[PDB]
Design a protein around this ligand. Structure first.
Ligand SMILES: Nc1nc2c(ncn2[C@@H]2O[C@H](CO)[C@@H](O)[C@H]2OP(=O)(O)O)c(=O)[nH]1
Ligand SMILES: [Ca+2]
Length: 104
């Protein structure tokens, strides 16, 4: 079973922790990856009720199992905060335009 299901993509907690760890390191060092400059701030326009406090940052989580290193980010993202706490896992899949819905 999946801990997080984003459309057809299935993720486990370990997939999320690995992705998040790489993103937080880049965040602490002030470095970015890709044309969209990940990780970058997630404004939470959707108004998701996260358990952890703002500010939030987003990083792509890939169905391939590899950690993002540039190129297409896919539709899935891991959202984390300043204290490296997982806020949630979201996706463009099943959401209109460039909006987001939570992964179940
Ligand atoms: N829908 C949405 N997009 C956001 C938010 N914060 C940042 N973005 C980014 O804003 C732009 C327009 O939606 C996109 O670059 C999207 O990023 P990603 O595609 O990199 O996730 C947010 O809270 N909601
Ligand atoms: Ca996996």
């Amino acid at each position: 079973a999946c801990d997080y299901t984003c459309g057809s993509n299935c993720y486990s907690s370990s997939d999320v922790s690995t992705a998040q760890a790489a993103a937080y390191k880049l965040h602490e060092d002030g470095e970015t990856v890709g044309s969209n400059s990940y990780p970058h701030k997630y404004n939470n326009y959707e108004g998701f009720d996260f358990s952890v406090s703002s500010p939030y940052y987003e990083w792509p989580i890939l169905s391939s199992g590899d950690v993002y290193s540039g190129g297409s980010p896919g539709a899935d993202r891991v959202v984390f905060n300043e204290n490296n706490q997982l806020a949630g896992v979201i996706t463009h899949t099943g959401a209109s335009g460039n909006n987001f819905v939570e992964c179940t």
